[PDB]
């Protein structure tokens, strides 16, 4: 007891995940007092409860961020934490379309005289 695996957590939705988190936090609260009162094979259980709390919070955050990404899939402006990170210079870099835009005279000249494939007889 005290070990909650992520395989069971990935199937739940939010309310029983909150219930599990509350139960784990309550068990950790009473067993901290049990730690300061006695010891034995008991401290492994509070370590397991701490890691289970971490797992439950991770699963809740991942599911709710996935829902937010699904909500913001088709919108122009995204939240800053949901936007891709990359680097600051990469985000300030010109886009591919804007970097590949050419003038109309350049487009005509490239349409009618591109670089050809050729060979020279020896």
């Amino acid at each position: 007891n005290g070990k909650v695996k992520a395989g069971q957590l990935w199937s739940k939705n939010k309310e029983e995940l909150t219930k599990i988190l509350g139960e784990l936090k309550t068990e950790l609260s009473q067993l901290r007092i049990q730690k300061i009162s006695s010891s034995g094979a008991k401290l492994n259980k509070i370590h397991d409860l701490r890691k289970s709390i971490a797992r439950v919070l991770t699963v809740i955050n991942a599911k709710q961020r996935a829902q937010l990404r699904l909500f913001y899939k088709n919108k122009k402006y995204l939240p800053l934490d949901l936007r891709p990170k990359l680097t600051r210079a990469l985000r300030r870099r010109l886009s591919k379309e804007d970097a590949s835009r050419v003038l109309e005279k350049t487009k005509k000249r490239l349409t009618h005289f591109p670089q050809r494939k050729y060979a020279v007889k020896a």
Binding site: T26, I33, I36, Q64, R65, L68, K76, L78, P79, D81
Partner: protein, 52 residues
């Protein structure tokens, strides 16, 4: 005009930083606390330093 943003700057509302399980750590098992229990109806706890 007040702000009416087209996107929230923070998608995640943060969890409460200091809940009750973080406020209360463990009681004090020392003899001063043990004396105060019967002499004062007073319990002594070790708590988080940010809690009022």
């Amino acid at each position: 005009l007040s702000r009416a943003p087209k996107y929230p700057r923070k998608s995640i509302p943060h969890e409460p930083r200091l809940d009750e399980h973080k406020i209360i750590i463990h009681p004090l098992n020392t003899e001063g606390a043990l004396k105060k229990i019967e002499e004062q109806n007073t319990l002594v706890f070790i708590v988080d330093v940010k809690a009022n």
